[PDB]
Amino acid sequence: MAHSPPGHHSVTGRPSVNGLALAEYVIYRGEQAYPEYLITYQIMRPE
Amino acid sequence: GTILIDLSPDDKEFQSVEEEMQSTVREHRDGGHAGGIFNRYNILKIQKVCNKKLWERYTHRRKEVSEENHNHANERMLFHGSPFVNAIIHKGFDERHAYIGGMFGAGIYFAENSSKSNQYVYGIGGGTGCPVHKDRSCYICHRQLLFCRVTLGKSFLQFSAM
Ligand SMILES: O=c1cc(-c2ccc(O)cc2)oc2cc(O)cc(O)c12
Ligand SMILES: [Zn+2]
């Protein structure tokens, strides 16, 4: 596991090409997230 | 230490979590290679994850970050998909959940698009797909992902050619 950029707590990956993609984020300490909801699901075949 | 509480589909909490799942599906540039071809999910169950020690670990760190960032934790709710979801809920996130080779360094990755985290449920790039059918687009097998509370604090902004 790497470090955060100096003086930052996380990284925001902001898609610059695909205008419809939303952001992705990276943290470098496990204590900075809490797994609050577990979601059980199937993907659905389009009709 | 962890207990899982089933939420009723009638509960406002279930419905707002489901809404976040469904409304953040997008098309992917691999045409469904990694996570399958789909526009929506069949939600089977939503459980609240309850662990005192892991929660207190989280809020202690959140306060430290907040204090280093003009009293702003910059807390989000974000999706995480992983073959290790069962370890995560019992033991918390750690370096064994790090995407060593990811775009923005060796860290733990989260997404606003549920369909992005879905590409990681069976491993990096969808791995070999579901355990039963070896199918990255399996419509039968049950998948699981996490909807997580994440402290971002001061976040480095990286524009990416994605
Ligand atoms: O939900 C995510 C999960 C993971 C992931 C990546 C590697 C692992 O060994 C375990 C999980 O990567 C990601 C990478 C992204 O760019 C965005 C994500 O949401 C995820
Ligand atoms: Zn399957």
Short mmCIF file of N, CA and C in Angstrom, two decimals, chain A residues 37, chain B residues 7-19 46:
data_model
loop_
_atom_site.label_atom_id
_atom_site.label_comp_id
_atom_site.label_asym_id
_atom_site.label_seq_id
_atom_site.Cartn_x
_atom_site.Cartn_y
_atom_site.Cartn_z
N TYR A 37 -23.18 -1.21 3.93
CA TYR A 37 -24.26 -2.03 3.38
C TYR A 37 -23.69 -3.12 2.49
N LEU B 7 -32.43 -5.58 5.82
CA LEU B 7 -33.38 -4.49 5.71
C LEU B 7 -34.58 -4.96 4.88
N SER B 8 -35.79 -4.55 5.29
CA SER B 8 -37.00 -4.91 4.56
C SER B 8 -37.09 -4.04 3.33
N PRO B 9 -37.55 -4.61 2.19
CA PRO B 9 -37.76 -3.82 0.97
C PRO B 9 -38.75 -2.67 1.18
N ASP B 10 -39.54 -2.73 2.26
CA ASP B 10 -40.49 -1.67 2.62
C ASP B 10 -39.82 -0.52 3.37
N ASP B 11 -38.61 -0.75 3.84
CA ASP B 11 -37.90 0.22 4.65
C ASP B 11 -37.36 1.33 3.74
N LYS B 12 -37.54 2.59 4.14
CA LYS B 12 -36.99 3.75 3.40
C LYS B 12 -35.45 3.60 3.18
N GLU B 13 -34.78 2.98 4.13
CA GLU B 13 -33.34 2.80 4.03
C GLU B 13 -33.00 1.84 2.88
N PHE B 14 -33.73 0.73 2.76
CA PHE B 14 -33.55 -0.21 1.65
C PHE B 14 -33.76 0.52 0.33
N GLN B 15 -34.82 1.31 0.25
CA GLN B 15 -35.18 1.91 -1.01
C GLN B 15 -34.17 2.96 -1.44
N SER B 16 -33.61 3.72 -0.51
CA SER B 16 -32.66 4.73 -0.95
C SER B 16 -31.32 4.09 -1.37
N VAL B 17 -30.90 3.01 -0.70
CA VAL B 17 -29.71 2.25 -1.12
C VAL B 17 -29.92 1.61 -2.50
N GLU B 18 -31.07 0.98 -2.70
CA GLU B 18 -31.38 0.40 -4.01
C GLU B 18 -31.39 1.49 -5.07
N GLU B 19 -31.92 2.66 -4.75
CA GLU B 19 -32.00 3.72 -5.77
C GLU B 19 -30.59 4.13 -6.23
N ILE B 46 -30.39 -6.55 1.02
CA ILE B 46 -29.52 -5.44 1.46
C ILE B 46 -29.40 -5.62 2.97
#
